[PDB]
Design a protein around this ligand. Structure first.
Ligand SMILES: Nc1nc2c(c(=O)[nH]1)N[C@H]1C(S)=C(S)[C@@H](COP(=O)(O)O)O[C@H]1N2
Ligand SMILES: Nc1nc2c(c(=O)[nH]1)N[C@H]1C(S)=C(S)[C@@H](COP(=O)(O)O)O[C@H]1N2
Ligand SMILES: O=c1nc2[nH][nH]cc-2c(=O)[nH]1
Ligand SMILES: O=c1nc2[nH][nH]cc-2c(=O)[nH]1
Ligand code: MOS
Ligand code: MOS
Ligand SMILES: [Ca+2]
Ligand SMILES: [Ca+2]
Lengths: 760, 760
């Protein structure tokens, strides 16, 4: 079943509005609703906290403060704490300071605004330089990795390019907002939330309430979008909900209004990247030296892994004999940044990407050959390594880009464009090609495990359950498909159930594009046990050997006789053979050392390429993507439709990141862009007018679920091509380095134009 | 932990009203409430059905009729159907005809009464003779089993007794009544209910909705008692709930008001038992021939297995060279009878016990030696068999009864009584010893399976889950105990979860006193798995063998180091070892054939004995139990507290059965006793004033979880001593056979008195 383009498991339900998300679930009439009241300072001591106006507000029932917290007060996904309710001082504008449970969402919102709070302000750190200045950082100092000796390499280099440039963050904007609900259930709680990580929600709620893990059960059936935004900031909602619940005696739900959501949660780490890169006379890179300043926010969240991944991707798609990264994870008084599709990767990649382009302009070379010339070697003595020392044995980049350029009519188009430009004085088109190599697996190694539990009922139908969470990316269907493929029956007999830490325990968050790779195995593992039992039984019964019992298309065949799967199961039931099983999986071959920067942190890499073409307006910088062509490698895809879709969506999101998406804070730290009316994701019409997406269809070298390949994050990096192209257009307008910053808003583009035009 | 007298798992919650049973669960404001409208005819064709008044009644939302059922209309636990709504005709007073769904339980009841129905009455069959007469029956004819040649045997017997007697049914009176709730959950349903058989609730709900099983989940956390009454009559409530909820789009609950419950559900099968038994001059049984007429009601329900079980126990505790049974299972237009603690066994045993008393009286012998003399032989060439040919290899009655007689001062007490009676002309005391042997395992062999799913979280706590359902009998403690023992940690670390068919599938109803025998094994089975993975891991890590890793008391020990179980678990999680496992178990050695009456239908036999002392008043029949002494064999008890408890309570209920519980139908077939005000269970004061219960402590010969023994049903048979003792007091008043019938209400006793007295 694996391999066919079947629709998402809740397609119909989405499309008629029966699919329920969290705020849709029915709940008792006495359910309360909650809202945080937030700090209005970027950095201060809290000096007075009068809440009387709060308690007195209509419909309100309980109000909460760090002191009311019965046990832990900490939602951080990492060993250093992050209070859920402020403990004496605040650190960014948005930080929740107390919590309100009233008889209605509005009510709670309204009350949250009546507090009388006095602060003793303090100097605030809002910018990388400020941070740098004040040595405000995480991990007691920057992280440095080095392979070879760069300064040597670069001092003696025929060509060179130094450059510095800004990469702005990005707000997830998941259509369904953060949200959760908790229901006291004799002794313990049951939380429903919209999170990518129920096993953690469990852990944090448990600690928040002083309960052993077994007294807390998180169920989560679907999220309306997550993109990393829900890898951890689901914690504050769950904690508050469980805590209000334990106190008031009653169910408590909490959902952030959009404005709150954007102000409180984190975003993608914005980066400043400073690079020197250099090459040979023939164009082979000689070395690249990089410094990453990354804006993490006021607490650790997942900065640690994120910045590790960006370093880990600083080689972009190329082999480089010497390469250095110095990675500062700067602490600042603003939203605590966190995961976002790509998890650092795009930042590191775009780093190398910008440079190599700068390099190419420098030597009047065509960027594309320059790249193509430095891709890692194809597979099949001594294989090349990355700067962290992992052999790259499966890079099909050379082949693929070639194939893409042909199919995209790359060369010819390039000319048509030059011409067209030369005849225009107000508009310029530009086009670029960018590649992608992304590694698969958590860099924090022991997260790479998954479990599934499978049940077959006497009427032959099946209930599948696994650790992943469906956030729109088709995970469940793939897992259904794998299961139906391994048991030999039609998918229709397989039903998916909601994710539930009481059914599969100790899960990792659904992330690192590892949802399907791993859960897939786990389910397969369960289904294999089950199938095993069936064959054993059939065999003894029909005298003969298990391995000749065949399950296919809903039918079982043995010794010339054949029966319907149901008929087999019923009979195993009568025979008393267990029809239930768990299954589990752990990614092999991984080992690496973060501090040393050496090892094999990944199983295999994902690749792909994209050629985008755009036009810009020389007067105002207005601009847009006319056409894009992608060719991306999803292994032996488990579901081509489902994959094409992630590819298309990711691309858009990726581009979105480098074009109109822009975060802005005011001089006092306030988030100015905190609502769709001022934070602008790709709207329907920004879709490329011609959008060709196709897949490289080749098995994965490594032994993954049906030789497929993760496909959720990788494709997000194809967005770079858009930025690259945007920059090709500026370059066409003058002979200077456009030095286009990201995000490329029109103001930004217009600025690049002028530089290149030499008008300042 | 196994072996300690620990409290029930939910004792704190029982005692402060926090434990929630089904009607306590909170549910959405829009939930609807249901009630059936019932037939008022014992047997007729439904000719007209005006429901208009119903739809018109206040708060009503939907009304249903067989025609409205969307798919199956059948709630029977057996191959022949039993409609949930009546189809054209009715067969007893109480049979549900249509179904109302209103915005409140009262509203529903009230509307249920407004229908205008016209019937076309038919002759009804209400008594055994009638049915016998009309050849009204199930299984197309009686069932006969014969071992040896009885006629021959009897004909040539030094001693003989023929007698015939009635045994009455019994209403469960579970303190929480039948009840269920169904929640549409996108495409499928979730049922909560109060039932001993969630996997079946699943089956029937599914079939009624037209859904594969996998779209139906039943969760059942605890029942307020079941005693058999919830082995199958949970079905109608669940089907109706689900059906109403498919149609109205909203959650529907249904619980039966007492009066309804007693009129609609079934009761223990009342019996008429005819016998001839005969012996040697020395007292050894020669043969015994038995006829069982059994009133099953309008529909199959579980008559089939029940009646098999009575045949199965017609040998009571005695070896009998020849013995025959003809068992009629007669259909009648009354409540469809069903399971009840003992499931036929008591009726069968009572049968033999009456007869051997009759024989004893006939030969001027003391019943007690008569019995003592014919018990099966102890264990340790050719071992005796039962009349179904199953060797009885573990009968310790001899040893046990002896011990009981002595500890209870039997003989001296017998004398004290004779004297006392001789000085008394209005009161008479009676005393009697009665033994029990009870087979353990469903007689419908493939039912004897169970499964469990266990989880260990990274803080070391543990979530246990198995297929059995808690109904007051202590199953979840015993299961927690086994788990804690096998894993080597303190029980506090293990929490039980609600029975849930999406977690352990395809379960048998919890019954046959086999809840723990089996789930215990399965739970051991998963724990052993998990403890296996842990040892493996410690082994590898500390180099050494797994069999030397030791879990005890919450601590793990190997090569001279030790750590806390939780430290092991966390370490395993980081090593990426699955901490989840299912478990399964199927009882071995069983094989037997219903039709022939031959086989091993049981793993082992439960035994015990009870001596009861009573007084009756020769004027009105009033009477009461003064003192009871029991010695019962629970194997190596999994929890002596919990086991003494089942013995106590069961004794009471058993006596209850043969003394004040009495069912009564009027000429039209209407149940006259349908409420506690007229059906009378033992009340506090009818407890024996001196009530000594003690356990026989010997490991089971068979390999049962910790060598323990089922103790749910067997001990109910100890009630028979109460009846036998009431009969001894009658006997004490005259030289004639009292012919005491059951139930021995005071009317009944007085009647016996007079027979004995020759006063008619
Ligand atoms: N439609 C949709 N796709 C998505 C997301 C989402 O929230 N919605 N989250 C992304 C992120 S951050 C990851 S890490 C992958 C997860 O895919 P996977 O489960 O198979 O690993 O989904 C990507 N694709
Ligand atoms: N307190 C209590 N004890 C009880 C019952 C009950 O509803 N409540 N049901 C009886 C019946 S019919 C059976 S079959 C056993 C179940 O014992 P087991 O589950 O451990 O097999 O409960 C016996 N004892
Ligand atoms: O290496 C990681 N990659 C991720 N992608 N999305 C979430 C991720 C995470 O925790 N770690
Ligand atoms: O043999 C059985 N004995 C039972 N006791 N309680 C329920 C039973 C059943 O289904 N079968
Ligand atoms: Mo990915 O970024 S959860
Ligand atoms: Mo027992 O009789 S469920
Ligand atoms: Ca966010
Ligand atoms: Ca009943």
């Amino acid at each position: 079943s694996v391999g066919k383009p079947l629709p998402h498991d809740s397609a119909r339900a989405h499309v008629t509005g029966q699919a329920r998300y969290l705020d849709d679930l029915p709940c008792p009439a006495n359910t309360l609703h909650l809202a945080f009241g937030l700090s209005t300072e970027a950095s201060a001591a809290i000096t007075g906290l009068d809440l009387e106006p709060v308690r007195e507000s209509p419909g309100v029932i309980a109000v909460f403060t760090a002191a009311d917290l019965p046990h832990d007060n900490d939602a951080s996904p990492a060993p250093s704490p992050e209070p859920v309710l402020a403990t004496g001082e605040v650190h960014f504008v948005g930080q929740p300071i107390f919590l309100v449970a009233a008889t209605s969402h509005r009510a709670a919102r309204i009350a949250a605004r009546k507090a009388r709070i006095t602060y003793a302000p303090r100097p605030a750190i809002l910018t990388l330089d400020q941070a740098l200045a004040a040595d405000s950082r995480f991990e007691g100092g920057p992280v440095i990795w080095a392979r070879g000796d760069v300064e040597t390499a670069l001092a003696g280099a025929a060509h060179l390019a130094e450059g510095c440039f800004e990469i702005g963050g990005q707000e997830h904007f998941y259509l369904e907002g953060q949200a959760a609900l908790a229901l006291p259930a004799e002794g313990g709680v049951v939380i429903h939330c919209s999170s990518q990580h129920p096993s953690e929600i469990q852990h944090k709620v448990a600690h928040a309430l002083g309960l052993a893990f077994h007294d807390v059960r998180v169920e989560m059936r679907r999220m309306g979008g997550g993109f990393g935004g829900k890898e951890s900031q689901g914690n504050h909602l769950a904690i508050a909900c469980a805590v209000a619940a334990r106190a008031t005696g009653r169910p408590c739900k909490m959902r952030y209004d959009r404005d709150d959501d954007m102000v409180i949660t984190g975003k993608r780490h914005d980066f400043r990247i400073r690079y020197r890169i250099g090459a040979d006379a023939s164009g082979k890179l000689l070395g690249a030296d990089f410094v990453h300043l990354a804006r993490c926010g006021w607490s650790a969240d997942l900065s640690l892994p994120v910045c590790d991944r960006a370093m880990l991707h600083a080689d972009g798609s190329y082999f480089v004999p010497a390469l250095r990264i110095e990675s500062h994870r700067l602490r600042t008084n603003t939203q605590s940044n966190t995961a976002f599709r790509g998890f650092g990767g795009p930042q590191g990649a775009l780093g190398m990407e910008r440079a190599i382009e700068h390099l190419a302009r420098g030597m009047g070379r065509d960027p594309a050959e320059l790249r193509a010339l430095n891709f890692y070697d194809p597979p099949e003595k001594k294989t090349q390594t990355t700067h962290y020392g992992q052999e790259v044995a499966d890079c099909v980049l050379g082949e693929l880009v070639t194939r893409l350029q042909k199919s995209a009519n790359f060369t010819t188009r390039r000319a048509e464009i030059a011409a067209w430009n030369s005849t225009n004085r107000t508009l310029a088109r530009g086009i670029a090609l960018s590649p992608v190599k992304f590694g698969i697996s958590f860099t924090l190694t022991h997260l790479n495990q998954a479990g599934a539990l499978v049940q077959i009922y006497t009427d032959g139908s099946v209930a599948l359950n696994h650790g992943g969470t469906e956030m729109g990316q088709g995970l469940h269907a793939k897992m259904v498909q794998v299961a139906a493929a391994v048991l030999g029956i039609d998918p229709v007999q397989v039903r998916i159930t909601a994710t539930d830490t009481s059914k599969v325990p100790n899960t990792s968050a659904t992330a690192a594009s590892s949802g399907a790779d791993m859960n897939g195995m786990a389910v397969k593992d369960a289904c294999e046990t089950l199938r095993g039992r069936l064959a054993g039984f059939v065999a003894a019964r029909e005298g003969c050997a298990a391995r000749d019992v065949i399950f296919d298309a809903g039918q079982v065949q043995a010794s010339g006789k054949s029966w319907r799967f149901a008929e087999i199961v019923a009979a195993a039931y009568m025979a008393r053979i267990s029809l239930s099983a768990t299954g589990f999986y752990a990614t092999p071959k991984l080992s690496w050392d973060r501090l040393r920067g050496q090892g094999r942190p990944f199983l295999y890499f994902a690749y792909g390429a994209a050629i985008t073409e755009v036009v810009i307006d020389r007067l105002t910088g207005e601009n847009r993507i006319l056409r894009t062509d992608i060719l991306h490698d999803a292994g032996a895809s488990l579901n081509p439709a489902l994959d094409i879709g992630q590819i298309e969506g990711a691309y858009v999101q990726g581009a979105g990141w480098l074009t109109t998406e822009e975060l802005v804070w005011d001089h006092c730290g306030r988030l100015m862009t905190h609502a769709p009316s001022t934070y602008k994701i790709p709207a329907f019409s920004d879709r490329p007018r011609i959008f060709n997406v196709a897949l490289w269809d080749q098995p994965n070298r490594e032994e993954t679920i049906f030789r497929s390949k993760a496909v959720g994050e990788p494709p997000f990096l194809l967005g770079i091509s858009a930025f690259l192209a945007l920059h090709d257009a500026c370059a066409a307008c003058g002979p200077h380095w456009p030095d286009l910053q990201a995000p490329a808003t029109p103001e930004a583009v217009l600025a690049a134009v002028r530089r290149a035009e030499g008008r300042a």
